Design a protein around this ligand. Structure first.
Ligand code: MK7
Ligand code: CL
Length: 267
């Protein structure tokens, strides 16, 4: 009844903007779920950097890395959109600052730096997801080339569902121990790029941790979130979009609306 109405509204939303919306949304309290295209591949874009953040915290936990060890890169020519790494060019960042910045600011340099030195490249990142039972996630390329969002391209894609379940495992489950889990949570809650997406779909006093992605080709944009409504078990929302023509702009509003529809579906 609600599920049915939610999918009519979604498919009318994708018709309205002439592309493709993928949703999975979970109540971790009532186990109600809503899925639309939830097993299609969409480009990850910047959204994978929320999972990279977790990968970093797992290496810290294993004690291969210290969250406060200094990471230096004076040598380095920073990647387009390294808003945070560029200002710390002379001094170095701590590993934990760098990782948060990858997540919260979508800092490219931080992304590539961490994958080059700490995670074994894009197949390491891929391998990290496999290790938590996610068989859909694939990272093939580095910043910024992973953002081409070419139609029918496998590279640098995942599914709405797989992202949702993974975030569930990472943010809420038993992959990260207690202190490390708290940090990843605080990092997602601090994301700065999400104010027009899943955050716009929910009341002000709901707590939201998020990571967005904007490929900037085929109007490809996404967001995933953990949501803590006051007095309620967290929800996980995961929303991936593409559009039909290459030069079409991403739509913050389609995302926020699909979130609204998905949450009402599962609430
Ligand atoms: C990620 O999707 N990125 C990095 C950055 N933050 O994304 S957001 O969704 O967190 O706002 C902005 C755009 C995007 C990216 O790097 N896109 C490239 C811009 C330059 N060449 C085309 C793709
Ligand atoms: Cl180069």
């Amino acid at each position: 009844n609600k599920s049915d109405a939610a999918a009519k509204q979604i498919k009318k939303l994708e018709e309205d903007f002439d592309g493709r919306i993928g949703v999975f949304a979970i109540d971790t309290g009532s186990g109600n779920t809503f899925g639309y295209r939830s097993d299609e591949r969409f480009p990850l874009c910047s959204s994978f950097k929320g999972f990279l953040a977790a990968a970093v915290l797992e290496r810290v936990q294993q004690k291969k890395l210290d969250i406060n060890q200094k990471v230096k890169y004076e040598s380095r020519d920073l990647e387009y959109h390294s808003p945070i790494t560029t200002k710390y060019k002379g001094s170095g960042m701590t590993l934990g600052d760098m990782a948060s910045a990858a997540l919260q600011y979508s800092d490219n340099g931080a992304t590539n730096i961490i994958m080059e030195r700490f995670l074994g490249g894009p197949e390491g990142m891929t391998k990290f997801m496999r290790s938590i039972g996610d068989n859909e996630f694939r990272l093939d390329r580095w910043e910024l080339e992973l953002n081409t969002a070419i139609p029918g391209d496998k590279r640098d894609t995942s599914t709405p569902k797989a992202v949702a379940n993974s975030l569930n495992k990472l943010a809420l489950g038993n992959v990260l121990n207690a202190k490390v889990k708290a940090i990843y949570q605080n990092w997602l809650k601090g994301n700065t790029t999400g104010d027009a997406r899943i955050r716009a779909s929910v009341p002000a006093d709901w707590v939201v941790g998020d990571k967005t992605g904007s490929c900037g080709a085929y109007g490809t944009a996404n967001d995933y979130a953990v949501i803590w409504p006051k007095n309620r078990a967290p929800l996980i929302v995961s929303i991936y979009t593409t559009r039909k023509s290459k030069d079409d702009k991403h739509s913050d509003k389609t995302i926020a609306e699909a979130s609204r529809i998905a949450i009402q579906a599962i609430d």
